[PDB]
């Protein structure tokens, strides 16, 4: 739509420093004053992982399939991946710590002519969710780019998917990860898995941080071959931010 | 009221401590089931002071004084009361740093009609607002008890208020004061002054807190004359939720 992107290459040198292949969006106050180290990067779209659990959530609410914001998911007993997923979790609960289960059955429920409508109506991604509607963001042909993470993440903070204010808000609190007087952030986590090194999966980090009267909205990918460099999802973005006088 | 309310007399333990006079209230789920040190001083009307910013921030926005969430109540440069407010906030960093002149001009806006209103379909209170618009909750008639406070909070929660369920919302989010995981509060201090001795002001701590599928209510405040009284407020109900497991 509109998008005021300059590529910066200072902001390599911490990728360099640690030998990773990834890019970082950052805005400030909208996607009209963006910068990145890597334009064609930043527009190249990759597997949604768990950051795919922040459009879910909303098409979830919009369809009534989650009640509201007060429903709680049972455990069954049937065991999980990960032990912290075993147990029952509130909506922000079960985003918070990416459980895979709880939102497949919401997408099943959901239905895939419903999924196709809203992924269109959000201008998510490549909008192909083929490939079995349980597992289409973690192992599918669902992609989608830094660029285009921003632009939705804009779009939710300012209340202009086309879904109810309600339901934004919603999931706006859920995403909320630290919470100061004056310095709010909202983050979202993902991780593809190890792939192979012929083809490396992906790590994310998606969110937005408001500073005094100022925000700012970023995106981060990094090509992951080796679970323990899961970390710098963090470490980069967070050094980078703290350069521009942001994280503090 | 449907609040069934249980004296239970070994909190005194951590007020005598400190040789403070005050009430302790927690509710685990609901109003229908809530503990205090003190019976009686639950039911005791005190000054909310800025607690009072919680109906407040709702009314400017039910009445459209304060347009949405991301209004910016700008600085003019004037001298304040408090050298964390002079500077432009956000509505969640008035509300984080308790700026009261950013509210005194909202209520002036709002005007006494419609704050009467509104208090009196929030039950908030004695809902007595005499005494000068831009003051009543800070030195004028208005007074509100721990027991009214966690009501209030409750209706908040479940988004039961006569307000939008979007203004509940946005008001929510202000208040997050702490968020982890499966761990989130919202909460709010307030403090009249130091009054006499003869006559002490208040001091509170209300809120509530998310813990896994659990939620607790709470309602703090005590007599002070000495500022440096003031981390009280917060230091006795923190040992006391600790105590019942809740926050630790």
Redesign the interface.
Do not use: C, F, N, Y
């Given at each position: 739509g509109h998008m005021s992107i300059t590529e910066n290459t200072s902001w390599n040198k911490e990728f360099s420093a640690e030998a990773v292949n990834g890019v970082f969006v950052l805005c400030k106050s909208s996607s009209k004053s963006c910068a990145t180290n890597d334009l064609a990067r930043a527009s190249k779209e990759y597997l949604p992982a768990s950051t795919f659990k922040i459009p879910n959530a909303i098409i979830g609410l919009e369809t009534g399939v989650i009640k509201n914001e007060?429903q709680?998911f049972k455990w069954d007993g049937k065991p999980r991946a990960m032990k912290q997923w075993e147990?029952?979790?509130?909506l922000?609960?079960a985003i918070?710590?990416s459980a895979v289960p709880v939102f497949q059955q919401i997408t099943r429920e959901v239905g895939e002519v419903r999924m196709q409508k809203y992924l269109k109506k959000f201008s998510y991604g490549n909008q192909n969710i083929s490939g079995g509607i349980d597992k289409f963001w973690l192992e599918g042909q669902l992609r989608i780019s830094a660029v285009n993470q921003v632009e939705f993440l804009e779009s939710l903070y300012?209340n202009k998917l086309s879904a109810?204010?309600?339901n934004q808000?919603?999931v706006?609190?859920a995403l909320?990860?630290?919470?100061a007087?004056?310095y709010?952030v909202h983050s979202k986590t993902g991780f593809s898995g190890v792939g192979t090194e012929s083809n490396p999966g992906v790590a994310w980090w998606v969110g937005w941080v408001?500073k005094?009267?100022e925000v700012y909205f970023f995106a981060f990918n990094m090509d992951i071959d080796n679970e323990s460099k899961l970390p710098l999802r963090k470490s980069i973005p967070t050094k980078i931010m703290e350069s521009e006088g942001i994280i503090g």
């Open positions: 007060h709680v147990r029952d979790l509130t922000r609960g918070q710590v300012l109810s204010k309600e808000l919603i706006k609190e909320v990860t630290e919470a007087p004056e709010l408001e005094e009267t």
